[PDB]
Amino acid sequence: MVKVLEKCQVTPPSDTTDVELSLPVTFFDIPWLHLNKMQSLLFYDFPYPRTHFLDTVIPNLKASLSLTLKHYVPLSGNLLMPIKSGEMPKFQYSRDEGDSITLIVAESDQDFDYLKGHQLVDSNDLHGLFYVMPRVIRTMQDYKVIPLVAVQVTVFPNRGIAVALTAHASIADAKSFVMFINAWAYINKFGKDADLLSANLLPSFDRSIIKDLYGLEETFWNEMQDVLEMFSRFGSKPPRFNKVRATYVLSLAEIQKLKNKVLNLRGSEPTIRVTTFTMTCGYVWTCMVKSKDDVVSEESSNDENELEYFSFTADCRGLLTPPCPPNYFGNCLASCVAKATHKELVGDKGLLVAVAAIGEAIEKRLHNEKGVLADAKTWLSESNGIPSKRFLGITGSPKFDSYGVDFGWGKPAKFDITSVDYAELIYVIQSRDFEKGVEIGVSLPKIHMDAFAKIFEEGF
Ligand SMILES: CC(C)(COP(=O)(O)OP(=O)(O)OC[C@H]1O[C@@H](n2cnc3c(N)ncnc32)[C@H](O)[C@@H]1OP(=O)(O)O)[C@@H](O)C(=O)NCCC(=O)NCCSC(=O)/C=C/c1ccc(O)c(O)c1
Question: Where are the active-site residues found?
Fold first, then answer.
């Protein structure tokens, strides 16, 4: 139901930029090189005519994106994946090659209030607002050239706007990419001389400080060879998802209720660290493991002692040596994995088991002495020995200003991390309406979603 009105290319300004920019791939980026789709969807109430969209909004967006790209030059380039053995990946922007961001201008007749809503949405409707980027746009002698960012802007006439960004995982983590969206909108909202610095929207691309003192680069690269070839010949087009989106909102008061429920279950136990993050993920992890039971598995209690896994990442910028600036643009994640027994998660203290298992995972990865990289040589080998039916991961973070992306028409009505449907993942972001609250985006088949909503709304 989405019709494409225009496909054009957006580049940095010809003047204040340079014909070339080689950015190195750090050992942090190596584990993400197979993920060519990281998806951020933003919805905006926009009760204005379609002519105002095409004659004013679109031209300004094309102008602000270009202005923004003067500070985010590598996002306008590509990722070069070595085609010959004994060569390493890198990033590059080549103005003489025409490297640019594809911007799609589209229109839809689907119902806008439905698509930005918090109750169920067909996943395929969300994924249908995105532009499908090519896997390889060009092939040099040493490497194959892989695009990094494309954005589709869709207009729901007289009702709203959807901004659908796709980014390669290797160029940015959630923190970095959200800073890029906010910079784009900020410049579009306040013009060219807007002060990105004073808004903390200026990135740093200096990777001379990221040092690989543990040889993880060689270690990760060799381990990624297998994963890369799997994802090498896999369909660039969105699979027909069998899942529905639902969104849940936990106020800071409802977060408090969950902490006090853990402190009353504890009943004299080792001081467990309880944050919004641990509490939110704890709660959602318990509901998720229970809902898998209510959809009744024909393996009786045979499983209950098997381990359930919750996989998340953490930002390491502030833990590195040499110091790493907070605005370092790129990947800088550590892998953390919580685990507990199925029977204990579903039991009468499951919430407490999940929070302590998560707080334990953060402590073994970050609070380790020596450093975050102390145990880094196992970050990849650890996430493999985990079964698909016992795995849950989370994407996004409540720390990032997902609802600060105001292009000048107001803050988003809804921010969806659409790439959540490709796996058993959830997403957690800053709540639009509640100061220290969160939004959980869940991605489940309809019948399983029903079970989940039951428990989630239930005991709480
Ligand atoms: C991992 C976390 C979240 C840990 O959470 P958390 O424990 O809440 O850390 P914190 O918020 O700094 O701590 C605050 C709490 O510390 C608590 N605390 C600290 N120590 C203790 C203690 N010892 N005992 C009890 N409490 C303690 C305090 O009580 C604080 O208050 P509160 O939170 O309860 O209100 C955090 O440290 C971190 O690193 N977060 C970043 C996660 C991250 O980087 N995720 C990125 C994944 S990439 C991703 O998912 C998607 C990328 C992407 C790209 C392009 C696209 O287009 C796209 O769409 C997507």
Answer: 169, 406
